[PDB]
Amino acid sequence: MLIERISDPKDLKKLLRTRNNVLVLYSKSEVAAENHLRLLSTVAQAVKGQGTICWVDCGDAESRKLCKKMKVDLSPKDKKVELFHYQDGAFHTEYNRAVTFKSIVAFLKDPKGPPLW
């Protein structure tokens, strides 16, 4: 399924309030996002009803403010995108496992209950 693009902070705010398992792809540019978007479209289909995936083009001047609000760091030269996971309306973690269909699907289906302490 299509990965929808968000630019307006109010729209991300609404998404995070209404969906409890959200992956946001923050990209340096539309071109930088291409390969990730191709894969994520298939992941989104596989997790329909369980997870929501969207993207923000931080290269877009009108989206820069949103990327800053969300604490995105795309400053490193070898980093094209950042994948952030939001659980129950708040930032949970940067995605840090393999960027593959099976891995991302399993991540979105895995319970992440409270820390052991």
From Swiss-Prot:
Any GO CC annotation of this UniProt entry: endoplasmic reticulum membrane
Recorded superkingdom: Eukaryota
Subcellular location: Endoplasmic reticulum lumen
Record bears the keyword Transmembrane: no
Disulfide-linked positions: 58-67
GO BP field: electron transport chain; protein folding
Keywords: Disulfide bond, Endoplasmic reticulum, Isomerase, Redox-active center, Repeat, Signal
GO molecular function annotation: oxidoreductase activity; protein disulfide isomerase activity; protein-disulfide reductase activity
UniProt keyword annotation of Endoplasmic reticulum present: yes
Subunit structure: Interacts with CALR (via P-domain).
Family: Belongs to the protein disulfide isomerase family.
Protein name as annotated: Protein disulfide-isomerase A5
Species assigned in the record: Homo sapiens
Taxonomic path: Eukaryota, Metazoa, Chordata, Craniata, Vertebrata
Gene behind this protein: PDIA5
